[PDB]
Design an enzyme around this catalytic site. Structure first.
Site, PDB file in Angstrom:
ATOM      1  N   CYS A 175       0.683  -1.037  -0.015  1.00  0.00           N
ATOM      2  CA  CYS A 175       0.021   0.063  -0.026  1.00  0.00           C
ATOM      3  C   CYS A 175       0.903   1.142   0.090  1.00  0.00           C
ATOM      4  O   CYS A 175       0.303   2.398  -0.361  1.00  0.00           O
ATOM      5  CB  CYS A 175      -0.742   0.106   1.193  1.00  0.00           C
ATOM      6  SG  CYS A 175      -0.282  -0.229   2.854  1.00  0.00           S
ATOM      7  N   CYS A 212      -1.780   3.663   1.494  1.00  0.00           N
ATOM      8  CA  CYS A 212      -1.256   3.924   2.705  1.00  0.00           C
ATOM      9  C   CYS A 212       0.050   4.909   2.792  1.00  0.00           C
ATOM     10  O   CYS A 212       0.758   4.795   1.855  1.00  0.00           O
ATOM     11  CB  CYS A 212      -1.164   2.720   3.615  1.00  0.00           C
ATOM     12  SG  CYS A 212       0.503   1.843   3.255  1.00  0.00           S
TER      13      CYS A 212
END
Ligand code: NNR
Ligand code: NNR
Ligand code: RIB
Ligand code: RIB
Lengths: 249, 250
Positions: free
Chosen positions: A76, A158
């Site tokens: 991510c 992320c």
């Protein structure tokens, strides 16, 4: 079909079924971690999303079986978005192979640079024309596909997310794009700390700091409202930037 | 407790709770992809696996809450197993940063080189002694932890799986190890095509082909029975092997 109407957009890419199948086989060949995929099932789910359905009422749910079969975990914190400059983003990830664009995932790889659509109550692909998003309808098989997969890709990011922007255009940040209208609004503030924009220089303009451009200030305001921090860098010499990523020794 | 018996193994590592907590925070700091993890919950689930329980009746199910919280996707084709040569395996992955040992996962990272056990009906960690797998009992918190996480790690591998073996010892392949009795038997043939062994040489092996060693042939027979292919390579110069991974430009 005797009911099939004319659309303003180009028809389905020739050999679309065979092209998707060949791409799926090639992708799993290149990526051993995805060799659990059954490419016949993938195509069957892809075809089932739009075949025999009116190509102006396609929904995100129509693509859910394909989304499930194409499930893929990309790190991510290694995600690269792009706006208008797809060529450089892909060259970058071809060198920085631990970074991934959407087109580096199986699903993005299958559909990259293709068009497709069907017709209601028939099993036939429409090779003559497909709906144009402006002149015909917005909920067509292609547009619905990318907004669905793009949103899912952004939702998985992320830490720091990078986006390449095309600095040679009048709207370096364009609200009327997949990035401006899908991706930027579906980065999860709980997971993403910073959006770092890479403004790729080009065109016929004298060198200047394009992070001061009004559309970048617009972008900064949008992401700040979502409680995500913003960072911007100029990529003045794209050819030299790639050379440094390849051999930073 | 007035019911606690003496075990033959060493007691829980000093500062075990603080060490696990510090490691969890450090790991998620280094690995942004794992920052969804709540380290308090991780410790609580870790603690709940063995505290207040007799340390000879621990089961895999006791650790399931920790397993769930510790879920981590590593690229299944980039997994490195090892047998006895743990230090070089970790040195390798520190340089070849796209490959992972179990200790490069969060769960393996927390427990590496640590010992722990509790007692039935009490909330106290036993810092005095813990069961030895041989002299006391095999189903102790430490042994059950590693056989559980090692099995799941092996089950996740795909394509080509690598194992480093210590070629300086008499039994280069040892059935009496985590690799020989857990990992090799839980590679999934549907996902794994080949198990490639890297025999690490020791102090002056006369450049002998250790892939012909009887214990290696034993390994080849075991894995072949499971319908997985086997490949073997000698690492003659471990120090030079690392430098070539550091500087392939030469
Ligand atoms: N990689 C792609 O082809 C891509 C990515 C994001 C959005 N789109 C849209 O789909 C159409 C067909 O290629 C493109 O014109 C975009 O509208 C395509
Ligand atoms: N990484 C480790 O320390 C490790 C890996 C696999 C098994 N074990 C067992 O745990 C005990 C305590 O560290 C060791 O003696 C091994 O039996 C440890
Ligand atoms: C926004 O970013 C994607 C590249 O990751 C691109 O396909 C568009 O959807
Ligand atoms: C077998 O392989 C693991 C390293 O990946 C080690 O911990 C042992 O369990």
């Amino acid at each position: 079909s005797r009911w099939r109407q004319q659309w303003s957009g180009p028809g389905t890419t020739k050999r679309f079924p065979e092209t998707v199948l060949a791409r799926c086989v090639k992708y799993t060949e290149i990526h051993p971690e995805m060799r659990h995929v059954d490419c016949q099932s993938v195509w069957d789910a892809f075809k089932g999303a739009f075949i025999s359905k009116h190509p102006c009422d396609i929904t995100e749910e129509d693509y859910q079986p394909l989304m499930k079969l194409g499930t893929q975990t990309v790190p991510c914190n290694k995600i690269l978005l792009w706006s208008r400059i797809k060529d450089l983003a892909h060259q970058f990830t071809q060198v920085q192979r631990d970074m991934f664009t959407l087109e580096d995932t199986l699903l993005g790889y299958l559909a990259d640079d293709l068009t497709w659509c069907g017709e209601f109550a028939t099993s036939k692909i429409n090779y003559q024309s497909c709906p144009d998003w402006r002149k015909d309808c917005s909920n067509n098989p292609v547009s619905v596909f990318w907004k669905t997969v793009s949103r899912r890709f952004a939702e998985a990011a992320c830490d720091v997310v990078h986006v390449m922007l095309d600095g040679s255009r009048s709207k370096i940040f364009d609200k009327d794009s997949t990035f401006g209208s899908v991706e930027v609004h579906n980065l999860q503030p709980e997971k993403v700390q910073t959006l770092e924009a890479w403004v790729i220089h080009g065109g016929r303009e004298d060198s200047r700091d394009l992070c001061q451009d009004p559309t970048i200030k617009e972008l900064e305001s949008i992401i700040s409202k979502r409680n995500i921090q913003f960072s911007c860098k100029n990529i003045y010499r794209p050819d030299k930037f790639l050379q440094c990523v390849k051999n930073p020794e």
